[PDB]
DNA sequence: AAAA
DNA sequence: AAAAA
DNA sequence: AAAA
DNA sequence: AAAAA
DNA sequence: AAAA
DNA sequence: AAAAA
């Protein structure tokens, strides 16, 4: 009878609760929505953020953050997806994934893992492109499991580990740094017109090394720049960053009069700006907990290096300026260190003189309760600079909730041209 | 301690009706 | 006075029918009595048969691998008897196998039990630790309790064995709550 | 047993829904005029499967009213609604130290506005607590259903509000959830994007203290509207006074045309 | 020093006269000593003759349906001793059945008891948590402590059992309140 | 309770960028 | 923390008078 | 031009 | 946006 | 005159 | 003077 | 006329 | 009247 083409502006409500749990220095999804071409969108997220309880009193802070993105589905599909939109009704269902048996085999994508065992390929896509292009080191290799069911039990669980806190050996440079440049100048002559040529080359090479990894550093160096669909990257949209306290218990019977327990309770707010969705996509909202990189066994490196020369410590702008990279071993900056090739890597002349490094005295080596490295940051420099969070497991008391949990809510209204209730139900 | 994130499962309803189950319901 | 709404090994709240078979003891094979299943488990023996041998023999369980913890709490309660002195001593034993075992692996642990003997009859009401993770990929750890002997006296035992794992608690009414 | 708050899977369609309605046109030949009489008794069929089931309905929809005393039905006089919040507190000794025990304790009132009773009868005050409804086990339907089509994820207007509704099982939302004839309902044909579900994660199954309905609701259509009470036994510890208790004062004056005590007990 | 306010097994006020019976155990019709009462009870024995048998006895009580709460707590103490070795254990017991019985019924369930036993003296101050809700409608619960033997040695034993259930609590006095 | 001495681990940064690691990485 | 429901059992009197034993009572 |  | 507000 |  | 102050 |  | 006041 009546055929309807068109509907009004209705606000829809997208309102949900979740309950949120991980490790440190994890990256977990913590909520999504899918979204229309034409979409007003707006989120905002309220909540409570807590840790396990501490085996003794609060010593440090932990740092969270928070990320919202959006990905269009032309970016997860590509060409399929543009075909698919062009079919119409008639047009062939997209490709899907391969999940796990298990309930909680996608944990980091934010949902319930479903009995079928399969499920739409945006989400876990999307998840692979964010961690791409913002969290991982510039020089290590992507990730590019095909399916979730091909990742380990920790990293579908938890999350993929991400980056330390930049610090000395945390943030090193680039395993591509060159310490010398040769020529081939003649046997007993040389031309000073082809070296003016090399130092070009040269200055080119070290800007890629430091500066320009990814072909958006090297379109902006240009003074241009590059839309998030020329790198197919996803659009960030809003980032917070907190630190999270709480109080003291103390303990009034016979054995415990004296000692006290740290429990940690933050409230947040995460606010996102009024967006205009421009495609159809998926919205994601993440979270990552971290702590100070602070270590037991850590000295300075003057006192590392024990015999010291003009060049180490007079600090001559001639000398700091002018020289090669130096390279230093893990020896001159932990107690037990390493000296072999994987405990080696490169750092400015003289970095020493523009940071001093922390101090934890001998009597709180191997004490339960205080979140620290014991020892020394284990392994080559892919493991040195990821986070591992079974070395925190001595400041925490056992529980199934990990490391860290909370509770949010995540206030959702968009303004969406879809049909009512009543429009779909009545046939006339 | 906690009220937004305690109280309710979603947001205020300022929209179209959603659910319609044959009359009134309680 | 009050009550001590406090213990050491709560129980399952059924147990297994008494039932009958002989074992022979074992070092690297020792046998397990009934097939394990998850968590807890109680039992009892109207007649269980012992050879002249050496080694042991062990009720087991499967430990439950959901709520990711390493360190747990396990707990045992068991009043064994019988008409004669077979000189025997009790641990408990942790030992993870790919599969579902009927014996013992000849690689285990043993955790220090304290209970009472005073001629056969042994009784305990303990509780102890012990590690949940698999040392090895793809295994499934096993927990249980083992009567262990260097040299057995034939004879015929009885009594009853419960075994449970605290992976959740159990609530009990209060009156003054 | 009362029903759960309105959510997709407690606030399905009604049993008596149509996705087909047939005509008898003829072997070669169709009367459009008779096609035109067919699409108005669906309409009036439709509309007493959602809206109008109660016969009190059916006069409000030609713009009348009917009083209580038409279809002889209970008189509302007021309806209160609140929620109940409280504090924790922590153990101090050993092995307590670091846990904490969550009570709720919540003052309210119930004011009713002043009543001309017109008859003898009754007048009864009754109360209901009930949880939102989150479970544990439960997914996005895009993410359930896996392989998606034009028609579920385009959100076009034209196939959203021109197709009859849609038949989708319990496994669609949660996990090992059935396939069979007592779990299938209807729904609208884009109901998923008008809504978002909670997201527990698997840290909290099984975790004693949490209300929370443990995996999926279970039964036909009639037990899965139905809360059961059994299901929350979890959340709290053992007592003799239930899962809820309250403590009131009902503070009540009538203006009654009764003789005094004095004039009762004395003869003149 | 201070006083223990708080301990296992709440005693009834009152206890029954000493009597004396013989039974014989049973393995599918384990005889009951007395008529089961209502929540708590303690009785004491002359002489408690057993002939040779294999089987079981027990002292039942009858659970108390109000109060409705699933998980409640029975305790146990006795010490029961005699002149000669009987060859026995013991453990809590539970059944449930539609009238009044006199025996035990062929099926029950077990719970484990941590005691002492030297030669055949037997003395424990135990508690468990039980389930109380029937399995199938318009049936009572019953629970006690039962005795079993693989193989009964004819003799007579004498002593004292008492039963408690916890559906309230006592008070004492306590000077410093 | 503590402020200065249990949030982060050095002074605001007022000078020259210190790392150079080839790109952002958060 | 809890005064009306918990002091009294019944409203305050404005009415005729209810019981009548022979005299005053306390 | 760099604190890219 | 790690570095008291 | 009562709500004495 | 039992009936929130 | 519907957000009945 | 489930959706902070």
């Given at each position: 009878?009546?055929?309807?083409?068109?509907?009004?502006?209705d606000?829809?409500?997208?309102?949900?609760?979740?309950f949120?749990?991980?490790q440190?220095?994890?990256?977990?999804t913590?909520?999504?929505?899918?979204?229309?071409?034409?979409?007003?969108?707006?989120?905002d997220?309220?909540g409570?953020?807590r840790?396990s309880?501490?085996?003794?009193?609060?010593?440090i802070?932990?740092?969270?953050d928070?990320?919202?993105f959006?990905?269009?589905?032309?970016?997860?599909?590509?060409?399929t997806?543009?075909?698919?939109?062009?079919?119409?009704?008639?047009?062939?269902?997209?490709?899907?994934?391969?999940?796990?048996?298990?309930?909680?085999?996608?944990?980091?994508?934010?949902?319930?893992?479903?009995?079928?065992?399969?499920?739409?390929?945006?989400?876990?896509?999307?998840?692979?492109?964010?961690?791409?292009?913002?969290?991982?080191?510039?020089?290590?290799?992507?990730?590019t499991?095909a399916?979730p069911?091909?990742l380990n039990?920790?990293?579908?669980?938890?999350g993929?580990?991400?980056?330390?806190?930049?610090?000395?050996?945390?943030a090193?440079?680039?395993?591509?740094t060159?310490?010398?440049?040769?020529?081939?100048?003649?046997?007993?002559?040389?031309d000073?017109?082809?070296?003016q040529?090399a130092?070009?080359?040269?200055?080119?090479?070290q800007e890629?090394?430091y500066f320009?990894?990814?072909?958006?550093?090297?379109?902006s160096?240009?003074?241009?720049?590059?839309?998030?669909?020329?790198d197919?990257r996803?659009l960030?949209?809003?980032?917070?960053?907190?630190?999270a306290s709480?109080?003291?218990?103390?303990?009034?019977?016979?054995?415990?009069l004296?000692?006290?327990?740290?429990?940690?309770?933050?409230?947040?707010?995460?606010?996102?700006?009024?967006?205009?969705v421009?495609e159809?996509?998926?919205?994601?909202?993440?979270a990552?907990?971290?702590?100070?990189?602070?270590?037991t066994?850590?000295?300075?490196?003057?006192?590392?290096?024990?015999?010291?020369?003009?060049?180490?410590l007079a600090?001559?702008?001639?000398l700091?300026?002018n020289?090669p990279?130096?390279?230093?071993?893990?020896?001159?900056?932990?107690?037990?260190?390493?000296?072999?090739?994987?405990?080696k890597?490169?750092?400015?002349?003289?970095?020493?003189?523009r940071?001093?490094?922390?101090?934890?005295?001998?009597?709180?080596?191997?004490?339960?309760?205080?979140?620290?490295?014991?020892?020394?940051?284990?392994?080559?420099?892919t493991?040195?600079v990821?986070?591992?969070?079974?070395?925190?497991?001595s400041?925490?008391?056992?529980t199934?909730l990990?490391?860290?949990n909370?509770?949010?809510?995540?206030?959702?209204?968009?303004?969406?041209?879809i049909?009512?209730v009543?429009?779909s139900?009545?046939?006339? | 301690?906690?009220?937004?994130?305690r109280?309710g499962?979603?947001?205020?309803?300022k929209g179209?009706?959603?659910?319609?189950?044959?009359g009134?319901?309680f | 006075?009050?009550?001590?709404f406090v213990?050491?090994?709560?129980?399952?709240?059924?147990?297994?029918?008494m039932?009958?078979?002989?074992?022979?003891?074992?070092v690297?094979?020792?046998?397990?009595?009934?097939?394990?299943?998850?968590?807890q488990?109680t039992?009892?023996?109207?007649?269980?048969?012992?050879?002249?041998?050496?080694?042991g023999?062990?009720?087991?369980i499967?430990?439950?691998?959901?709520?990711?913890?390493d360190?747990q709490?396990?707990?045992?309660?068991?009043?064994?008897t019988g008409?004669?002195?077979?000189?025997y001593?009790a641990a408990?034993?942790?030992?993870?196998?790919?599969?579902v075992?009927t014996?013992?692996?000849?690689?285990?642990?043993?955790?220090?039990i304290?209970?009472?003997?005073?001629n056969?009859?042994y009784?305990?009401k303990?509780?102890?630790?012990?590690?949940?993770?698999?040392?090895?990929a793809?295994?499934?750890?096993?927990?249980?309790?083992?009567?262990?002997?260097?040299?057995?006296?034939?004879?015929?035992?009885?009594?009853?064995?419960?075994?449970?794992?605290?992976?959740?608690?159990?609530?009990?009414?209060?009156?003054?709550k």
């Amino acid at each position: 009878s009546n055929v309807q083409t068109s509907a009004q502006r209705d606000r829809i409500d997208l309102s949900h609760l979740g309950f949120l749990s991980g490790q440190i220095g994890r990256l977990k999804t913590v909520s999504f929505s899918p979204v229309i071409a034409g979409d007003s969108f707006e989120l905002d997220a309220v909540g409570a953020l807590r840790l396990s309880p501490l085996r003794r009193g609060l010593a440090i802070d932990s740092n969270v953050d928070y990320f919202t993105f959006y990905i269009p589905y032309r970016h997860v599909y590509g060409q399929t997806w543009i075909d698919f939109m062009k079919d119409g009704v008639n047009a062939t269902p997209l490709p899907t994934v391969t999940t796990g048996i298990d309930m909680d085999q996608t944990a980091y994508l934010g949902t319930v893992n479903p009995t079928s065992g399969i499920m739409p390929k945006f989400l876990h896509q999307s998840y692979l492109n964010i961690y791409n292009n913002y969290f991982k080191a510039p020089w290590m290799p992507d990730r590019t499991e095909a399916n979730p069911s091909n990742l380990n039990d920790a990293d579908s669980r938890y999350g993929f580990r991400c980056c330390h806190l930049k610090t000395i050996w945390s943030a090193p440079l680039p395993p591509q740094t060159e310490i010398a440049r040769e020529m081939t100048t003649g046997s007993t002559t040389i031309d000073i017109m082809g070296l003016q040529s090399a130092y070009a080359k040269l200055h080119t090479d070290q800007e890629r090394d430091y500066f320009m990894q990814r072909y958006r550093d090297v379109i902006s160096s240009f003074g241009g720049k590059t839309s998030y669909d020329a790198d197919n990257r996803p659009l960030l949209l809003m980032r917070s960053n907190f630190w999270a306290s709480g109080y003291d218990v103390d303990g009034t019977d016979q054995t415990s009069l004296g000692q006290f327990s740290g429990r940690v309770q933050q409230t947040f707010k995460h606010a996102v700006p009024r967006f205009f969705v421009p495609e159809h996509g998926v919205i994601m909202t993440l979270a990552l907990v971290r702590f100070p990189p602070t270590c037991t066994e850590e000295h300075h490196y003057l006192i590392g290096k024990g015999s010291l020369t003009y060049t180490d410590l007079a600090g001559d702008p001639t000398l700091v300026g002018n020289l090669p990279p130096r390279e230093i071993a893990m020896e001159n900056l932990f107690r037990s260190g390493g000296t072999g090739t994987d405990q080696k890597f490169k750092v400015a002349e003289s970095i020493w003189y523009r940071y001093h490094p922390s101090y934890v005295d001998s009597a709180y080596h191997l004490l339960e309760g205080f979140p620290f490295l014991q020892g020394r940051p284990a392994g080559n420099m892919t493991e040195r600079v990821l986070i591992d969070h079974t070395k925190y497991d001595s400041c925490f008391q056992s529980t199934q909730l990990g490391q860290w949990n909370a509770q949010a809510k995540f206030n959702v209204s968009v303004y969406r041209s879809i049909p009512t209730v009543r429009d779909s139900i009545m046939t006339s | 301690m906690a009220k937004s994130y305690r109280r309710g499962s979603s947001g205020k309803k300022k929209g179209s009706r959603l659910w319609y189950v044959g009359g009134s319901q309680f | 006075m009050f009550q001590e709404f406090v213990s050491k090994h709560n129980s399952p709240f059924t147990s297994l029918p008494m039932v009958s078979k002989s074992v022979t003891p074992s070092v690297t094979a020792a046998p397990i009595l009934s097939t394990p299943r998850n968590q807890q488990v109680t039992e009892s023996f109207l007649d269980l048969t012992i050879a002249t041998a050496a080694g042991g023999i062990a009720s087991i369980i499967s430990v439950d691998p959901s709520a990711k913890a390493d360190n747990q709490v396990f707990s045992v309660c068991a009043h064994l008897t019988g008409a004669a002195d077979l000189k025997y001593w009790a641990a408990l034993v942790r030992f993870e196998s790919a599969t579902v075992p009927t014996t013992v692996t000849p690689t285990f642990d043993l955790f220090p039990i304290a209970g009472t003997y005073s001629n056969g009859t042994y009784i305990v009401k303990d509780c102890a630790t012990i590690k949940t993770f698999p040392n090895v990929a793809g295994n499934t750890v096993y927990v249980g309790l083992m009567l262990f002997s260097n040299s057995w006296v034939a004879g015929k035992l009885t009594g009853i064995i419960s075994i449970n794992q605290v992976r959740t608690e159990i609530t009990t009414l209060q009156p003054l709550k």
